[PDB]
Design a protein around this ligand. Sequence first.
Ligand SMILES: CN1CCc2c(cccc2Nc2cnn(C)c(=O)c2Cl)C1
Ligand SMILES: CN1CCc2c(cccc2Nc2cnn(C)c(=O)c2Cl)C1
Length: 101
Amino acid sequence: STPIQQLLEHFLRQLQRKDPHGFFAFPVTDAIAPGYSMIIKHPMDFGTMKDKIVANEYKSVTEFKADFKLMCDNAMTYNRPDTVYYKLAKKILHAGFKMMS
Ligand SMILES: CN1CCc2c(cccc2Nc2cnn(C)c(=O)c2Cl)C1
Ligand SMILES: CN1CCc2c(cccc2Nc2cnn(C)c(=O)c2Cl)C1
């Protein structure tokens, strides 16, 4: 594991601690979220992010942060402002970015 891989594994562990229900742990299915794949062009989740780290698909912290933001943006797009996923996505976006400086 390269230095970037190690740093990103650290960040991912800390980010996932902010999602204790694991709402962002795995891809959203259309079964749980009707029409999701039609509304969200580029899905993302922490599990996919983990696989990308292990496959050495991130070459910068900027790339990793963009996937994190994509995941949060997707939750803020499909879900309405009032809602649990929207609020958590917005919360962890800000805290996570701060955490990753
Ligand atoms: C395997 N996981 C997939 C994701 C998930 C599960 C359970 C409860 C909430 C979620 N996460 C959702 C679900 N629906 N929507 C619309 C979302 O935006 C998220 Cl993050 C089961
Ligand atoms: C004193 N701080 C320095 C920063 C830091 C610490 C611990 C865990 C992650 C970080 N943050 C990093 C580390 N390395 N790189 C390359 C970064 O870009 C960031 Cl934000 C301890």
